[PDB]
Amino acid sequence: DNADLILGIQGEVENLLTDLNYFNAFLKEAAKSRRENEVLKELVKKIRKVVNDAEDSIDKFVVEAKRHDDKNKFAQWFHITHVARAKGVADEIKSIRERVKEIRDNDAYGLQAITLDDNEERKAPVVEEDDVVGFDDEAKTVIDRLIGGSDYVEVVPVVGMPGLGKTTLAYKIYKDPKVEYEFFTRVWVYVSQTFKRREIFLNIISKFTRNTKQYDDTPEDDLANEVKELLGKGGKYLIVLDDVWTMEAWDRIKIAFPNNGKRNRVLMTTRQSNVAKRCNDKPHDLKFLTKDESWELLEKKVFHKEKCPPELELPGISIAEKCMGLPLAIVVIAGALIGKGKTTREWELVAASVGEHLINRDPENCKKLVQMSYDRLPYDLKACFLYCGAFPGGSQIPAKKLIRLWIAEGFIQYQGPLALEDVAEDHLNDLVNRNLVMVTQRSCSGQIKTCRVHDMLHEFCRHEAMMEENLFQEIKQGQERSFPGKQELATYRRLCIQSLIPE
Amino acid sequence: DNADLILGIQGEVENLLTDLNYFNAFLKEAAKSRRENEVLKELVKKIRKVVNDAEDSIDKFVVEAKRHDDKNKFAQWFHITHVARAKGVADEIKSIRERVKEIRDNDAYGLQAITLDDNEERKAPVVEEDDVVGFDDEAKTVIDRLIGGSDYVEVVPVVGMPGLGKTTLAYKIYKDPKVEYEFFTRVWVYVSQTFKRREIFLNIISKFTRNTKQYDDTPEDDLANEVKELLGKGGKYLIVLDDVWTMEAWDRIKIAFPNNGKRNRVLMTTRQSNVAKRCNDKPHDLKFLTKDESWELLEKKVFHKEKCPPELELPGISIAEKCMGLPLAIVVIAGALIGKGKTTREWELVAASVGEHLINRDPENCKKLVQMSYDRLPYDLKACFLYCGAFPGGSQIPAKKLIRLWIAEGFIQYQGPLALEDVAEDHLNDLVNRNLVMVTQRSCSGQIKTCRVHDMLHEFCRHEAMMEENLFQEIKQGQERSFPGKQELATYRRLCIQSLIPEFLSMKPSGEHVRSFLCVGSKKIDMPPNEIPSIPKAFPLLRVLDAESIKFSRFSREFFKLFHLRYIALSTDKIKTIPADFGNLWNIQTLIVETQQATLDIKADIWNMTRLRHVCTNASATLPSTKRPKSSKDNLVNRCLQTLSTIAPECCTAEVFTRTPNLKKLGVRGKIDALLESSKDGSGSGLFSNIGKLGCLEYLKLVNDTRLSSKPLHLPPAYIFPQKLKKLSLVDTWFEWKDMSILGLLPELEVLKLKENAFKGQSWEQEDGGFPRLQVLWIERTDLTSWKASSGNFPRLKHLALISCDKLEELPAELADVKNLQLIELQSSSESAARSARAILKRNQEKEQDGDKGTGFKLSIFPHDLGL
Amino acid sequence: MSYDRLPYDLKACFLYCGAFPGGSQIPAKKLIRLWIAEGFIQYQGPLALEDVAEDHLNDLVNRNLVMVTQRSCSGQIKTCRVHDMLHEFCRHEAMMEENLFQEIKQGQERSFPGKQELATYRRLCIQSLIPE
Numbered sequence A: 001d002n003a004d005l006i007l008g009i010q011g012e013v014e015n016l017l018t019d020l021n022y023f024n025a026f027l028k029e030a031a032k033s034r035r036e037n038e039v040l041k042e043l044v045k046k047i048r049k050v051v052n053d054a055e056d057s058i059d060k061f062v063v064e065a066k067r068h069d070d071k072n073k074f075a076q077w078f079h080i081t082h083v084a085r086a087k088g089v090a091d092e093i094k095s096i097r098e099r100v101k102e103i104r105d106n107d108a109y110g111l112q113a114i115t116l117d118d119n120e121e122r123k124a125p126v127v128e129e130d131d132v133v134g135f136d137d138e139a140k141t142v143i144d145r146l147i148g149g150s151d152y153v154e155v156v157p158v159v160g161m162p163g164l165g166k167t168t169l170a171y172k173i174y175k176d177p178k179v180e181y182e183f184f185t186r187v188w189v190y191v192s193q194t195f196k197r198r199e200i201f202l203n204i205i206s207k208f209t210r211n212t213k214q215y216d217d218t219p220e221d222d223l224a225n226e227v228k229e230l231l232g233k234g235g236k237y238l239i240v241l242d243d244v245w246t247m248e249a250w251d252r253i254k255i256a257f258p259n260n261g262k263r264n265r266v267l268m269t270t271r272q273s274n275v276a277k278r279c280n281d282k283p284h285d286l287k288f289l290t291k292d293e294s295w296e297l298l299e300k301k302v303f304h305k306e307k308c309p310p311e312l313e314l315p316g317i318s319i320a321e322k323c324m325g326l327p328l329a330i331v332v333i334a335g336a337l338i339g340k341g342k343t344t345r346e347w348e349l350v351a352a353s354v355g356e357h358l359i360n361r362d363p364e365n366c367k368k369l370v371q372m373s374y375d376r377l378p379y380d381l382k383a384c385f386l387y388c389g390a391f392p393g394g395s396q397i398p399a400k401k402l403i404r405l406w407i408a409e410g411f412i413q414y415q416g417p418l419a420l421e422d423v424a425e426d427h428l429n430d431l432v433n434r435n436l437v438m439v440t441q442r443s444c445s446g447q448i449k450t451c452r453v454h455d456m457l458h459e460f461c462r463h464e465a466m467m468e469e470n471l472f473q474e475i476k477q478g479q480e481r482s483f484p485g486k487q488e489l490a491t492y493r494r495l496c497i498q499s500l501i502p503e
Numbered sequence B: 001d002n003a004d005l006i007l008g009i010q011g012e013v014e015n016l017l018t019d020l021n022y023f024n025a026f027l028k029e030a031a032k033s034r035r036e037n038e039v040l041k042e043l044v045k046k047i048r049k050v051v052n053d054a055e056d057s058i059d060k061f062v063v064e065a066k067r068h069d070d071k072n073k074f075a076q077w078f079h080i081t082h083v084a085r086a087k088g089v090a091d092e093i094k095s096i097r098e099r100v101k102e103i104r105d106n107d108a109y110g111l112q113a114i115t116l117d118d119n120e121e122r123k124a125p126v127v128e129e130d131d132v133v134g135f136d137d138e139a140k141t142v143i144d145r146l147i148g149g150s151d152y153v154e155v156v157p158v159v160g161m162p163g164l165g166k167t168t169l170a171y172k173i174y175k176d177p178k179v180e181y182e183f184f185t186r187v188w189v190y191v192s193q194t195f196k197r198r199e200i201f202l203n204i205i206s207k208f209t210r211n212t213k214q215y216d217d218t219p220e221d222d223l224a225n226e227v228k229e230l231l232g233k234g235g236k237y238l239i240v241l242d243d244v245w246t247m248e249a250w251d252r253i254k255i256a257f258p259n260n261g262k263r264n265r266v267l268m269t270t271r272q273s274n275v276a277k278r279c280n281d282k283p284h285d286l287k288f289l290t291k292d293e294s295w296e297l298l299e300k301k302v303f304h305k306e307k308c309p310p311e312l313e314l315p316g317i318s319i320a321e322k323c324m325g326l327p328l329a330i331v332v333i334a335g336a337l338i339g340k341g342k343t344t345r346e347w348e349l350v351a352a353s354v355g356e357h358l359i360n361r362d363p364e365n366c367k368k369l370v371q372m373s374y375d376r377l378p379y380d381l382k383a384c385f386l387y388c389g390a391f392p393g394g395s396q397i398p399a400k401k402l403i404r405l406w407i408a409e410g411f412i413q414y415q416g417p418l419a420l421e422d423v424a425e426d427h428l429n430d431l432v433n434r435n436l437v438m439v440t441q442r443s444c445s446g447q448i449k450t451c452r453v454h455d456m457l458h459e460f461c462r463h464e465a466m467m468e469e470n471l472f473q474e475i476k477q478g479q480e481r482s483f484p485g486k487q488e489l490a491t492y493r494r495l496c497i498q499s500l501i502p503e504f505l506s507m508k509p510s511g512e513h514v515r516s517f518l519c520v521g522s523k524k525i526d527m528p529p530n531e532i533p534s535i536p537k538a539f540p541l542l543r544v545l546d547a548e549s550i551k552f553s554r555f556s557r558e559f560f561k562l563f564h565l566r567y568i569a570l571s572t573d574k575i576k577t578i579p580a581d582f583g584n585l586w587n588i589q590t591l592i593v594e595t596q597q598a599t600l601d602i603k604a605d606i607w608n609m610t611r612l613r614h615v616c617t618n619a620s621a622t623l624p625s626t627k628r629p630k631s632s633k634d635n636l637v638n639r640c641l642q643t644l645s646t647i648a649p650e651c652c653t654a655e656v657f658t659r660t661p662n663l664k665k666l667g668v669r670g671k672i673d674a675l676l677e678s679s680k681d682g683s684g685s686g687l688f689s690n691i692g693k694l695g696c697l698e699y700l701k702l703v704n705d706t707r708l709s710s711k712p713l714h715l716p717p718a719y720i721f722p723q724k725l726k727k728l729s730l731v732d733t734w735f736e737w738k739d740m741s742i743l744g745l746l747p748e749l750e751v752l753k754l755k756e757n758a759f760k761g762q763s764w765e766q767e768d769g770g771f772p773r774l775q776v777l778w779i780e781r782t783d784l785t786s787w788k789a790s791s792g793n794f795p796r797l798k799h800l801a802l803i804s805c806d807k808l809e810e811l812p813a814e815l816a817d818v819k820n821l822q823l824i825e826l827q828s829s830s831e832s833a834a835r836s837a838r839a840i841l842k843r844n845q846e847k848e849q850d851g852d853k854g855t856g857f858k859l860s861i862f863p864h865d866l867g868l
Numbered sequence C: 001m002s003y004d005r006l007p008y009d010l011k012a013c014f015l016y017c018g019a020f021p022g023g024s025q026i027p028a029k030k031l032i033r034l035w036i037a038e039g040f041i042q043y044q045g046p047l048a049l050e051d052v053a054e055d056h057l058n059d060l061v062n063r064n065l066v067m068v069t070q071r072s073c074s075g076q077i078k079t080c081r082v083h084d085m086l087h088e089f090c091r092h093e094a095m096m097e098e099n100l101f102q103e104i105k106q107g108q109e110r111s112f113p114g115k116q117e118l119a120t121y122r123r124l125c126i127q128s129l130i131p132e
């Protein structure tokens, strides 16, 4: 009859939802780790696109079903329009189902690769040793903080965004003459994101005992006891825990550090603020390089012991100010500029494409470093963090507005006793704790008022969201790139615009 | 023809059952271990949902096939309705078969992953070392227990729920100065759930010998011999076995511990009570932290050496009290709070979502710890344990009610010589032995009476059952979350509700796939008369109706359409009769009604319910006539009937007892004079003689509600009583104590309860002997004043109590000489009884001081401050 | 450990011994005749089927899975029985795993089997209440 069409398309809707459950599970499994196979990435993009189109069609069907109840309000004219709309969404659901069937039939190989998934060396970081720029005051502060304190084991944490230079400062402190005299025993430990406690203890033992083959059957608890004996027989000891990622790592490693009332110290570098807060009530937030220090570092990295040519001074300074005081960004730019021709035109070209260089020329250097923090994000927090890249770089995003946008976009799914605003605030706090988002202002009650992402993470978010995830696309003009045409605008899911809106 | 449709859909039914066998095997294999692949988990959810829908359709088909036999009773109208219903289930079976085919065709990859299943480091736990809170007394007790004992190897076990702090206490003992001086040799061994004996022995050897490469070809037996030599050459040795999980592990490791008469000790921490019981007859149950200690631990963990800010004191304390004294929960909360902003608003937010934090923020810390015990559960015990999460957190679940619910829900499948209740009790004992369920009260006979799950395990059960297994879903309001809509209510299998029941029922919910409604609320609610048919209309496939807290004034006709119903719990203040249409529910197992009326009439033919197991009431129930017509001439026997709690005295004929050969519990209320009166025939054996024909009878309760006892009553001779009777309860029956001697000739009697002046008389002297196996004796509100006994009168008496019996004067001194007497209760007694009790205590103290082994007798007098 | 080392043709013969009630003494002649009748003994050599079945019984006795309770004066096995615990194992394997045979009894809540499961029973062992 007249209402048979709604039930007929609803019959296809349940099957579409059943397929969507499988595809969403496939997307979650694929997002668990970074795939490097091109076929797998293309299949993931194809699955995500067909999923998003499926939600769009289902949302249209839900709206049509809700509006069907108002037939009596407009009689035949609304009946005719509703029939045409119902047929339109019917053929849309059919087309989606054909695409799902085509994916199942043709792309079975990638589905196998994810489902079974049958398919490393620990790279200790290397940092600047001699020409450390701007960390004289920071090192002196931490050294003075290491000297003074209680007689028990105290942890001085260094926190910051990825690439800030926590390890460079830690190594500068490690080699400082004042603590080389104050601390008789100095141990450097690289507590990577993944590590083995037995390997850590044996590495510490190797500092003192050359023969370590007699610990073959020694349990890890007795290895920790031996480490305690080796460290306690001397005077003060300073132990550097580099890149500690989780609270459990500190809890499980600290059993090997004895307490003797000798003012033993542990200097820990971490990207996580919660780990630092637990280990010390006042974590040391590493500073950003000033504009003058950024230019000085860039000049030293590019021209070695020599001064910059007078013609390259102005373009180079403009580049350094665009690095926003992050030493990792300055180092990457210096590597890119060294291969250039040392001319004003090419340096100005680099200044106009700082982000592209910082991301795409050498993804092996910095993109992996940012991906280390990004991939550890929960699956529901990845979309929330990538949303923050929609706003222009350097702008201050109100926390209330960002929370409302997250709830509106459906990222926050929650069913417990807390409100959705509280859950979104918890998500923002989690992002800030990982130092992926910087809080620029707080209310007098302690709430976050405005927050912004560092320019380099903002570039990473733009890269991931536009070219990999197709989360949102930006529209602008001014250069050879004009407003997008209908072909690619037909595939855009979210639209970010900043200027020339009426045009 | 007309009946061809039933066979046509049955043809599809066998194929559906064949597919269900494969899917159930797939589900069992997938449940053997915890899958981390998202596609695999989604497929498991899809398989489980289609399986559950298949059982629902098959159950509907079975009901339709059973009801097809009544075509002659309603002619064409029922024929038309049955045809429509048969077509409806036919298209339901077809839709299920299409979904099964779609799963087979599309989801083949996950089926491969489970079938072949082609796809770790031992993490020794780390515990607090310096700031151990509240374990000073516990450590001192265990240290003193380690010092004193026999000269052989003795094991001191520490038992408790996961996260209780057994290893923290063990390490505190391990580092205690008194045992560092007493025990020259101290060895710590981490006996994980999985371990290698060779690795354990080599680890122990490493404590003494640096060179261990010469044991490459040494057998494990000789390694154990070398460990024995190394440990025995010193003085005493203390060995800590951490997290021992099975009896075999202790049996296989202990071969390396020598016996030298040097008082060697083994301190073992375990989550299993049976392992502890074997290794020592009195396992040390680790205590829970008090509320003050929990707050102190939380304050130390969050604020280090500093005090809490004054504004955060009240919210923090509220959080600590919500952790229920579990140190693991306190540690997890402290980790979550350290990352917060140290403000009152955020701490209050955490206080409102303590469970969510304890489970979802860091599943790597605690959820894995609980999953360690949960995954070791047998596959048939996992559903039973998750059921315990339906009841509200902190509530006390009766063991009898939980057992009946488990049987009704079909979790207990058993075919041996034991009853289903015994199997369910064994399941509960297994859960308690693993310290997943805490027993809060036990009966005097040793049975479990009430049990509850710790709040944190209850949160884990809620997490697993709602988000992973879809076992049951909870309905509530008050916050932004409202009552569920039709879309998700269509997928809910079991419904747990606690409040606002009439408001939820006013919406006319859809419950086509709901098989259980559990009114777990404690408040008694009078259901409005217009909302009475809401329960059967909403949930046609209701299998369990736990409406004990709901008062029903009438029985609507739709209640008789619940042909899948197996459990009934109802309260009522108006119902006096059970309609005959209630007998149409042939699947009923347990029938509980709690009526305030004096009498209740069972007009429904409960004998037709062959699967019936319990009929528990509180008013005198009039059983229906056993006379059956020639259409049902066959002698159907209700062999599964276990309980007839409150049947009428006039219904205690030989006819009903023939149909109930396996009746365990029997109870009679009313004119018990009719029970004892001899029939008008020459023989003097009345209706009470029929009770003795029940060989399996074990419990008997008699309630005489009438006061017209103008003729003194006589107990029948002991050989008329059931031989295997184990418990007898009498109340308000107005007998005489001279008849106690008859009860003393019962060979199997163990528990006797007299209430509200069951026996009348001032004094009565018993001869020596009698009551061979009696262990529990309970008196309350009696006119007895004198009682004379002897040492041989109660060889095995253990419990003795008088409540409000101020008329009693004294007790025999032979009771103080009873070896098996443990506890005596005296309440609101005279000062002479108190002085006699003090003299008994003084005599016991003197006897213990004489040099013999301590008897361990204890005595309590309540109130303690009376007589001061 | 002992059962899995049995030859494939001896596993069915050993599980058959669980049909008789626990503790009963099974005549060797009757057991041999039953094995031949049930088709367990397939043989084509010069020896008789009774000799092959006797060899199977000797193999079971040699593995100490069957205890000989009486022997004839000529050395032959006259009566043999399985230990109660192995009999319980045979009952477990045959009823719940192999569906070799099923036992029918009453007295407790379990009654005589219905048509649904009786339709799948291959061999029926009964001890009492046969006319009922």
Ligand SMILES: Nc1ncnc2c1ncn2[C@@H]1O[C@H](COP(=O)(O)OP(=O)(O)OP(=O)(O)O)[C@@H](O)[C@H]1O
Residues within 6 Å of the ligand: A125, A126, A127, A128, A131, A132, A133, A134, A135, A161, A162, A163, A164, A165, A166, A167, A168, A169, A243, A269, A270, A271, A297, A327, A328, A331, A369
């Ligand atoms: N003060 C500095 N002067 C010069 N180069 C610096 C300075 N600080 C850091 N760098 C450079 O920046 C890069 C990244 O710095 P660093 O290795 O210290 O990272 P980090 O803050 O420890 O980060 P991560 O969390 O990724 O380990 C290195 O190549 C290092 O040489």
Ligand SMILES: Nc1ncnc2c1ncn2[C@@H]1O[C@H](COP(=O)(O)OP(=O)(O)OP(=O)(O)O)[C@@H](O)[C@H]1O
Residues within 6 Å of the ligand: B125, B126, B127, B128, B131, B132, B133, B134, B135, B161, B162, B163, B164, B165, B166, B167, B168, B169, B243, B269, B270, B271, B297, B327, B328, B331, B369
């Ligand atoms: N008295 C205590 N004071 C402070 N923290 C405690 C105390 N008892 C236990 N804890 C903490 O609780 C957590 C779990 O305790 P513990 O490691 O002793 O577990 P357990 O009872 O041995 O359990 P399991 O059976 O899982 O091994 C640890 O992080 C430990 O530090």
